[PDB]
Swiss-Prot record, chains A, B:
Name of protein: Pikromycin polyketide synthase component PikAIV
Active site: 134 (nucleophile), 254 (proton acceptor)
Name of the encoding gene: pikAIV
Domain notes: Cells lacking the TE domain are unable to produce methymycin, neomethymycin, narbomycin and pikromycin.
Species name: Streptomyces venezuelae
Binding site for substrate: 67, 135, 162
Organism taxonomic ancestry: Bacteria, Bacillati, Actinomycetota, Actinomycetes, Kitasatosporales
Subunit structure: Homodimer. Pikromycin PKS consists of a combination of multimodular (PikAI and PikAII) and monomodular (PikAIII and PikAIV) polypeptides each coding for a functional synthase subunit which participates in 1 (monomodular) or 2 (multimodular) of the six FAS-like elongation steps required for formation of the polyketide. Module 1, 2, 3, 4, 5, and 6 participating in biosynthesis steps 1, 2, 3, 4, 5, and 6, respectively.
């Protein structure tokens, strides 16, 4: 495929995953942007991946697509089967990843506002519970806060699957080559250069200062196996979030928790949703 | 073509040529490199573009290819016709631009050493006079110093056609937009991403600290037209070199001095070579 992918493959080989994401972020600034939610390229209409039973007033689940350049409307396919006849599961796309190619968001708030609009239109009057994995976990929380402060509509809950927020990212740096190697392993087709630029841009968004904590209760789902070696004397390698409502540990590692062990994640979410309703 | 080209086009549209060259330099570090002159991809054999008359001991002219990503073995075609029946003119390629694609030089000295080997093999025992335009002007002098100090073979002269060395580059930054538009206008084909990366890497080499002046006499050739608008209170907009042996002004601007007015450049060179011989 493209040169950015080739360069990225080399950087992951050289254990410089982080340095090249910075290049991707810098480079992405020259892509055409949208500065208002109105100006967004894509239809962010959420895709219905599971239907719950027939009713009322039950929360619907919204999957917030992660940052991975190999990602897309297939992240939640395996997870969603476990919600069939249990909950509606809607997957909302991340602006900048579609198809010309898609405009990039001018800042993260403009992307969130475009998602907030499509989510409120699709969910109707049902309460919404936001779910995201890894980078998507961080996006799920920023979308939660945006819905609350800017659209006056806080979600009923947030599910954070293996989040590594700023200040708790030491494991994610020690294992960066495993993380970089994971992106290339997950390729169904080659990662496009446009999507790699989108990924770098969003990675930079999420490293920035985003004060503002959602009111919504948090289910923290954590992998149980480390992704790489780790001396326990360094402290905890696990995913972290401040003051969760509930913590669930599931089999697998950062990656496999969402593949081979997706049902374990779904079971933790379903038990948690009943508890808070 | 490729995404680096797409981004670069947007950058010159947005008048951010300089910022995007910095991106190209950063991305170029993730390209395959050669760390010793032996390991060089290309043959670098100079191409004979003009023949002088039959002799002995007259200098041959060596054209040092510039950094332009749209460049190649055609930079000196129009200029060289004016040396036919006057001087041998050899055009030596710049390492990193050929064909797989070509390895990038790990530093500038490795590229210069690879060129030094091919030039000495080609020039035989004739004295050598290096010629370069703009960025190539800077490369010719770094090559002159390299030939003298590293290969014990100082050239007989250097011809610097419109050089803007560090510390005298203010006019060429103000006109960076015209430089970028010139690159795209000059495209015989689309600039490949590999060559844009090479161009960025060489630009970075040539901004860095390179003390050390060649012993060889310098003919400084200067355009007479500004490339763009210019407030005279900013000073002299013209190309600069410290303590030139001879200064020649020719019609045209930074660009057209080598196109429509190449014969005036050649006439300045031919008189100069006779004086110093
Ligand atoms: C999930 O892994 O995100 C996909 C991009 S991987 C990147 C190194 C990463 C990993 C984690 C978080 C963010 C993030 N990122 O986009 O920078 O958070 C949680 O774990
Ligand atoms: C000649 O114009 O070189 C073509 C590439 S433009 C690049 C920014 C540049 C422009 C000039 C000089 C060097 C140079 N460079 O750093 O490569 O010098 C003269 O004008």
């Amino acid at each position: 495929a493209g040169m950015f992918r080739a360069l990225f493959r080399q950087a992951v080989e050289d254990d410089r995953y982080g340095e090249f994401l910075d290049v991707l972020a810098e480079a992405s600034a020259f892509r055409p942007q949208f500065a208002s939610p109105e100006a967004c390229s894509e239809r962010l209409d959420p895709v219905l991946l599971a239907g719950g039973p027939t009713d009322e007033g039950r929360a619907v689940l919204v999957g917030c697509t992660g940052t991975a350049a190999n990602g897309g409307p297939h992240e939640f396919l395996r997870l969603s089967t476990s919600f069939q006849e249990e909950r509606d599961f809607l997957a909302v796309p991340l602006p900048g990843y579609g198809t010309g190619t898609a405009l990039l968001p001018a800042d993260l708030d403009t992307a969130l506002d475009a998602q907030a609009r499509a989510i409120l239109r699709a969910a109707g009057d049902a309460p919404v519970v936001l779910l995201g994995h890894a980078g998507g976990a961080l996006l799920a929380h920023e979308l939660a806060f945006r819905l609350e402060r800017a659209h006056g509509a806080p979600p009923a809950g947030i599910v954070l699957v293996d989040p590594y927020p700023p200040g708790h990212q030491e494991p994610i740096e020690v294992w960066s080559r495993q993380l970089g190697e994971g992106l290339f392993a997950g390729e169904l087709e080659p990662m496009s250069d446009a999507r790699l630029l989108a990924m770098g841009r969003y990675a930079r968004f999420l490293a920035g200062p985003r004060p503002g904590r959602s009111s919504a209760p948090v289910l923290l789902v954590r992998a149980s196996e480390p992704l790489g070696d780790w001396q326990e004397e360094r402290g905890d390698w696990r995913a972290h979030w401040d003051l969760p409502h509930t913590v669930a540990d599931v089999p697998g590692d950062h990656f496999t928790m969402m593949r081979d062990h997706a049902p374990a994640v779904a079971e933790a979410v379903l038990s948690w949703l009943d508890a808070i309703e």
